[PDB]
Structure formats: structure tokens, C-alpha cells
From Swiss-Prot, chains A, B, C, D:
This is N-acetylneuraminate lyase. The gene is nanA. Changing S49A: 21-fold decrease in catalytic efficiency for the cleavage of Neu5Ac. Aldehydo-N-acetyl-D-mannosamine binds at T169, G191, D193, N194, S210. Gene3D superfamilies: Aldolase class I (3.20.20.70). Homotetramer. The record marks S49, Y112 as: Required to correctly position the proton donor. Optimum pH is 6.5-7.0. Pathway: Amino-sugar metabolism; N-acetylneuraminate degradation; D-fructose 6-phosphate from N-acetylneuraminate: step 1/5. Belongs to the DapA family. NanA subfamily. Changing T169A: 4-fold decrease in catalytic efficiency for the cleavage of Neu5Ac. The lineage of its organism: Bacteria, Pseudomonadati, Pseudomonadota, Gammaproteobacteria, Enterobacterales. Changing S49T: No significant change in kinetic parameters for the cleavage of Neu5Ac.
């Protein structure tokens, strides 16, 4: 864990922009990468849940990884989410992430079909082998994956050879503290943006999140406030983030984010892929206003 | 609903055989189709959960659909499970099922990402359009999909134009009865093999199931016995099925079934795809005995 | 299990009548006991969930047990639901049930606080001791109790010395069959009325239910139809029961039942205890019509 | 909400001491009240979940409330948990709490039977009426109660006339922040001890907890640390609390706490009421050493 500390920080879970025909919008992808760099984000987590990975083909996910590395390699940290249900498919993506010069790979616990804990562990070992030296970020999201690991199971996973971090998308901040207590050196990313400040206090040392695409500097600000013992600033920031997240939960999170980015002149066409539908047009004034505010604040 | 009556019956959820390198085992696939036909199954449900769809590429799923239709078209009913999380991917598979001459398509409620009910409805409508005349079998499996439709939502879904059946993989037999009561003419497939007789009594008029690959005629026997008022025979058959299902749940159902079929000289290599592991060797004596019994019964 | 054979059958879960001051209405209690006897019910299950046990004192529950025994002892079977969260309170009620001459006691798995399996076993042992020879009906209702016993645990529970039956208020009809298979002689009551026919087919050999108070003869009719191989009659009866159950779920089940009984001239005041509220006025016409229908049927 | 400000703080959820005969141990109750006062606790929450409310009679609960008021009225704040499933029973306890001179009443959302939101509201209204001027602390504990109120429902409940606070025993710290945001003046108690620091950071302004009986000074330490901007001390204190809570979860929390208090010479007999069993003998050395360490610490 210690030798992977350079993975610590605040990393945006990158969205994947699509054009009007629902194909990859490469110009908006590049813009979004540059926008994140200019914001001072520590890194990008590519092809995750937020990137709409599970409605893309392997080739499409590869195309995104390739373009992001072209734009960002060596400028900020890059973590390739390569996870699929299939081990072999995940391995293909891990090999591609290596080819493109990513700093790390990551995989969601494979979902849909129930797998035993040992099966989960072998899946990660295989993907780690294919990544040929890139550290692995285990990605735990029980709300969506349906996988219910015990703490002892988590401890085993995060100590497999080659694992350098955990992306913990869980609101159980008792478990967050227990993981920190067991693994003093582990890179531990808070996954739910709406509890970020409280997650850091429990023991997370950074985060990966969808809303960082539009306001990542706020999360950076929370890290700084807490380190400096400025609790009022940390709380006020989290409150502002949560006002934004309330709205995005109403609009739909990925599409609301894309829409804000549209009004920030990053994303040409703010659609998610079917079966996601469009943002209700009623929200456009508020989302326009939020883009405007964030641009003035930034 | 009345127009798709001929979809009524007992349809095996076809397994997809793999070779030692985890590629499609085409020879075992063809043998398995012929074996199902020879034992009198009413039809095949291809590329479903049991078929390991969600650890196959679109191309791989199409290759399986194409080969099954070559072997079986016009001899038994053929239902293509075309469902993916992506609507567009599902549409590609529906078009392919039409080109290969399937009798119907089916799609699991798309999973992982939460979608609204309207989004679910638009997903089915798009797939129905791409199926170009093949009726749609809505596939509900809340335990794995994470989708929690209300009864009123199910009623709306199953009355969309082009829907001719529901595959109901749910153990809620109150809801089974309520669905039958609302839709007297709907083809209603019981999805949990271990409650088949009870599902029929509640209102299902057939089933789709994984264990039918090895003992489908027992389920047909249950249909006949209930039709004839022979409750004892139906219960006896259901008891024998459930003894087998207890074992398959211990072994892992798909790989257990593949292993029985291996000992029946149908499937050359009884592996599932990673991250599924192999069957524990401690279960082989029972799986071997079951194969021996079923060969002497059929 | 063989020793308790005479507990098999169809037993109404008796409602506890109250008046407008929320006091026990003993005259309506007696009337309801006689109304049930005349339906040809096999027995009564007194002071259960349906009997509003958990909003009564021990004294009130005892007063009700004593009166039911006066009215019905020797005429029909009598099961006293003595269960409380507290073991000692449950024991007091069990001792009282013995004094009043009940045929059996019953206890819900104690709820609210999580208890270990050993703790549940000791609770049943302690109540069985106080029951002083009355067999015990274990009462499993996971939806309300929060208790999630495994099948192995259920098996150990139902084979404790002194246990003569299981009241299984669960819709898992695989488990219903598995229980019957492990325990061929066990009295096994179906607890969800809206799956009664399917529950019998799975292996239940009777039932205990709230709706039996107003139409218990229908459930006896389903038992008889299944035995005689008249599957369509069993189905049609279950369908009629479920039409009624749809309405009672809309109105609130216990209070809807009490309201029907009120319109049948059995129950003076159709109230449940606070925090149950009254029936919505808009449903009274349907409840009155249902009472009239059921009175005509009988 | 502004008029209940004086209820803000760190209140121990008082344990109810029993003897080997499972009778109330009134001498140990007084000792435990005085011990808590000496720790500098802001107040006591009496006859709650931790107080084993739901395995006591009303008379027993009243006897405890009366003794605690004798020991502590005017010295620390006193909140009577009067909640039962029954509204009338809860009202009796509320009237008694008023007679005894408590500062506030509180009631768990009534459990076991599902009630409508309107029913929950009316339950709280009726208890408030019987509390005759004493403010109400709404008590939300979804894990045990089975009640799943929406945020809008919680907002309505905590703004009923007479409600002065919310005891929020939930680990959802997004919702904790949402509640603070909507109700800037509301007294908001964090209910899960093992996330106390993070709960305060999200917007709780105090807490009610079981483990405060043995180390309440630690929780007061966390409040002070956060107030000063001393994040390190707050984290270190929470970590120490969690080391203890890990052990208590292993041993069983209430009985583990009583056992520590026994080794501190406070509680004569460290038993909970049946169906709670005793502490496993294997854990006694750890609990004694813990008591010794806390005695040395304070």
C-alpha cells in the first residue's frame, strides 16, 4: 500500500460525452479532459460507472481510454476502470490500459450473477496479472453491484498482491473507519460525493466522484480545510456540494452533469445512452444558472 | 396476447457450452440442441441468464443464436433473449434473431443503472421495433436485475404493442395469480423451477428454466398431471425436481447442469466462464449418479 | 411431530374486537368465536398478529384466551399465541393457556432486537416448559419480525422437544416444499392466505389466516378440491379469495375484516387499536357489498 | 425548534439494570445514574432501545423513570422514551414522565405492524398531547423499526407542533446533512455511536448513545475538538470509541456495556432480560481489561 501513495487525492469519475446519434463525441471528450486538468483535479477515473461503461462495447471503452491518455498522460493521474462481469473482457481492457500508459487499473466487483468470495479474488488476481505492473484499485459499490462483502472479505481483497487502493462507494462510515484502522497506508477513496467531508473524517484520504467534473475544486477545498482544522469551511463546502447534488438527483445525475458541462462550453450534446432518457426541459434554467455560478466561482 | 398463444409451453433455458480455452464449444452446442429436441422440449430460450449471456460479446451471442436456429428452426419454438443494459445493443441482437428465423425475442429489464419506468417502457418498444414482427417476451427477474416494478407497471409493460408473454422469475405467487387475473390470455412462464407446480396452480401456463436441459419432461409431466387433476403425481414430480435443485444450488446451477450433461455425453467440457470457477470435485459422485438416473428415465 | 397430528387443518387467526373506547369488546369476541365455529373452521389461533397481540397487555391477552376457551374448548382446536419479545412474558401467557385448556401454544420469533439462533432456541425451550405439555407451534413471519432464519435453523427449531407444528408466514414455496421434505410428519400451516392453494401444493397441510374470519369455508373448500383432484375448483376459490384480499390490502386488512364482520352483524365496533386508524369512508360501500355477497354465499 | 435549544447535547441512553431473577435492580439503577452524572453527561435518555424498553411492562418502565427523576432531576437533562407500538400505552408513559418532571419525551416510530404516514403522525400528536407541555424527540431507527420514512415525511414529522428534536439512528449522513439544512434550529442527535464524529460534521449537534454509559467523556471530547477545529483529536477519539464498539459488537452491546459497568463496581449483575443470553465466558477477560483501562483513563 505504501508504495502506491502517489494515487492519493481527488479524482473525477469522467463522463463519456455522446453525439446526437449516441456515438462517442471525441471533441467533447477531449474538452472535458482539458477542463478537468485546468480545474486542478488530481486525476481522472476513466470508464467507470459515471463513464457509462456498462452501455459501451470493449472497443468503445478502449477508444475512450486511448483518447484520455493522449490528452492527459503525464499531466494528471490516470486510473482506467476496466471492470466487466467477464474476467476475460476485464483482462482485455487491463492490457489496453497498460498499452496506453495509465497509472492504475480498477474493477467493480463483477455483478448480475452471484459469485463466491474466492471467485471475486481470482477475478482481481487475473486482472492484476493482465495490467502487468499497474496497481489495482478495488471498486466496491454494493448499492448497484449487489455484492455484499464482509469487512474481513474487503480486508483480504485490498491486500492481494498488486492492490494499491480501494474506491469505497458506501455510506457506511463505521466500515470506512474500520478499513482505515486495519490499513493505515491504504489509499482509500470516498465514493459518495454527498458525504465526502464526513468520509474523510472517518478515514478516507481522497475521493473519486461524478460531480468533481463540475466542481472538483470544492472537494479539494474540503481536504485543505480539514487538514488545516477549518471545520466551518469544510462544512460550508459540503453544504454547497449537497445543494448541487439534490438537484442532480432530481434531474438524473450523469445527464444533469453533462447538461451543466454543456452550458460551460465543454459538452456539445448532453445525452446519456439509451435506456437513459433526456433531462426534463423544466430543469434547464436551473442547470444553466448552476453552470453560470460555477464558472464565476471557478 | 391471444395471437401469441403458440408460445405456450415448457422451454429450456439453453446453456452455452465452452471449450477448455473458454471459447464457444460449437460441437457441444449443436449436440445440446439436438439432445433437447430429442427429449421432447417444446422450445429453447437462447442467450438468457442460464446461457451466460452477460459474460459474452454481442458477436458471441449472435453466433450461438445462428447455430441454434440452424439446428432447431421449425422443429421446436425458438425464443432469442436479446437483452442487454444498452437499448442499441439489444436492438442489434433483436435484428439478428429476426434474420436467423427465431419465433420470438425476449429482454431482461435492463440492470445496474437505475432507470425510470418510462425508460424501461421505451427500451422494450425500441427492441420490439427492431424485432420486426417477432413477439416480445418481457423477462422479469428482480433478484438479479435489481428492478422492482409494481404490479401496475408489469401490467403496462405486458400490454405494450408486440408483447406476447411474460417470463416471471419471481417467487411471489400472489403476484403470479394477479397477473393471470388481469391478463386471462397472456402466455405466462414460471421462471423458478423449484416452484413450478405451485406457479402453474397460481396461473402460469408453462415455464422457462435452466434445469429443463436435463429433465424438462418432468415439468411437462407436471403440466399434464395438473391438467388431469392428478395432484399426487404433480407433487411427486415437483419433489424429485427439487431434490435435484437442492444439489445444483450447492454445486452452482449452470456448472452443475453442464457437469450432468457432460456425464450424459452431451457437453464435452462442463466449464462456465470466468469469474465462475469449476465445480468442486466433492459433488461429482452425485452429479454422475444423477446423469445415470436421468439417462435411464429418459 | 406424529404425536401432534391432530393439530392439522385450517384455523382462523382470530381478530380481537374492541369498542370505541378501545376497550375489549367481550360480547363481540364471543359472537366472532361462534361465527367461526359455524363456518366449519377446524380451530382458532388466538392473540396472534391478526389478533392485535402487540397492542394489548398481558392481562388483556389472558382475558381473551380465557373467553375463547369458555366458548370453544372441546368443539374446535384452540391454539394460544403467547409470543412476546420477552421470554418471561411469553411464559406467563403459556402458563395461562395451559390453565384455560388450550390444545397448543404458539410464539412468533421474538422481534425488534436481534437475537442469536441459540437465543431463539432457548426462548422456545422456555415457553415449552411453561406450556406444561401443550405442544408448540413455531411461528415464522420474516416480513414483520426481522428474523431471517436459515433453513437449517428452521429445521433445528421445529425439531425441539415439544414442537408440534410450524406456522410459516412466508411466500417462499421452495422453502415450504423443503420443510415438508425434511419433516414428513410435521404440521405445516400456510400463513399467507393469498397463496393458500399453492402453499398446500408445495407441502403445507393446512393454514392459519386472518381472512378465514370472513370466508374460512372457501379455504376448507380448497383443501377438499385439491384432495379430490378438482384443480379448477381450487383455482377458482383461490381467485375469489384473492379478489377479496386485493380489497382488504387497499382498506387495511384487519380493520377491513372487522368492518365486514360489522356489516355481518358479528362485531359491534370495527376498530383496530391506535395507531391503526379507521377505514377510509370511501371504502365502506365496497366492504358492505362484500359482507352482503359473503352472507348470500353462506 | 428554537425553543427546545436547551435539549442540545450528549445524552447517554441509559441501561436498565436487572438481577438474576430478571427483576429490576433499583440500587444499581441509582448507581448508574450517579455514575453518568459524574462523567459530565449532559443528560439521560431513559427507557429507550438501550434501556430494554420492549422487554419491560409499562409499570416497570414507569418505576425506572420515577427513580431516575429522583436521582437526577434538575442536575442533568432528562428525556423519557415513552414509545410503545400502542399509542395508548405510549400516552400513559408520557403522562407519567410529565408527573415525574422530565424535560422531554421521545417515542420510536411504532413498529411490527405497518402503519401509514398519517398514522405515524397521529401517534406522535396523541403522545405530545399526553406529554402536556414536554417537548417531543422523534426517534428514527429504521434498521430495527422497519419504518422507512421519506425525507419529506421526516420533515413533516419533525415540524409537528410540540416536536423539539430528532434522534436520528441512521448511518445515512447525506440525509443527516439534508435534515440540518432544512431545519437549521432543530436539535439533531446522532444515534450510531460508531460514526459520531462524522455525524456531527454532517450536521448533528449532539448524540444519544448506548456506549456513552462507559465512555461518555470521549464523546464530549469529540464535540469540543470539532468545535475548536482540532480534527486530529476528534478522529483519534472516534477511533478509540470504535475499538471499543468492535469488542461490544462481538460480545453483544447492551450486555457487554453492563459487564464493563459491573467491573467498574456500578452494576451488581450484568444481565439483560431473556431472550438475551449472558456474555460468553471467553470474552470476560477482554471486558474486564476494558473496564480497567477506562477507569485508569478517567
Amino acid at each position: 500500500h505504501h508504495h502506491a501513495t502517489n494515487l492519493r487525492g481527488v479524482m473525477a469519475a469522467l463522463l463519456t460525452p455522446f453525439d446526437q446519434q449516441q456515438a462517442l463525441d471525441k471533441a467533447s471528450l477531449r474538452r472535458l479532459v482539458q477542463f478537468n486538468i485546468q480545474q486542478g483535479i488530481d486525476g481522472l477515473y476513466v470508464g467507470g460507472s459515471t463513464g457509462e461503461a456498462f452501455v459501451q462495447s470493449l472497443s468503445e471503452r478502449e477508444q475512450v481510454l486511448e483518447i484520455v491518455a493522449e490528452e492527459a498522460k503525464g499531466k494528471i493521474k490516470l486510473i482506467a476502470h476496466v471492470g466487466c462481469v467477464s474476467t476475460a473482457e476485464s483482462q482485455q481492457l487491463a492490457a489496453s490500459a497498460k498499452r496506453y500508459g495509465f497509472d492504475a487499473v480498477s474493477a467493480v466487483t463483477p455483478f448480475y450473477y452471484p459469485f463466491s468470495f474466492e471467485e471475486h479474488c481470482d477475478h482481481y488476481r487475473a486482472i492484476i496479472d493482465s495490467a502487468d505492473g499497474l496497481p489495482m484499485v478495488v471498486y466496491n459499490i454494493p448499492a448497484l453491484s449487489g455484492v455484499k462483502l464482509t469487512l474481513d472479505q474487503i480486508n483480504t481483497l485490498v491486500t492481494l498482491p498488486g492492490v494499491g487502493a480501494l474506491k469505497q462507494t458506501s455510506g457506511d462510515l463505521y466500515q470506512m473507519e474500520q478499513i482505515r484502522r486495519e490499513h493505515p497506508d491504504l489509499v482509500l477513496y470516498n465514493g459518495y460525493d454527498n458525504i465526502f467531508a464526513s468520509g474523510l473524517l472517518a478515514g478516507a484520504d481522497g475521493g473519486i466522484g461524478s460531480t468533481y467534473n463540475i466542481m472538483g475544486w470544492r472537494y479539494q477545498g474540503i481536504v485543505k480545510a480539514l487538514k488545516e482544522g477549518d471545520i466551518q469551511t469544510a462544512q460550508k463546502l459540503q453544504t454547497e456540494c449537497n445543494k448541487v447534488i439534490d438537484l442532480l438527483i432530481k434531474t438524473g445525475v450523469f445527464r444533469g452533469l453533462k447538461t451543466v458541462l454543456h452550458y460551460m462550453d465543454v459538452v456539445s450534446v448532453p445525452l446519456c445512452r439509451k435506456p437513459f432518457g433526456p433531462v426534463d426541459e423544466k430543469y434547464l434554467p436551473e442547470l444553466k444558472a448552476l453552470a453560470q455560478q460555477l464558472m464565476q466561482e471557478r
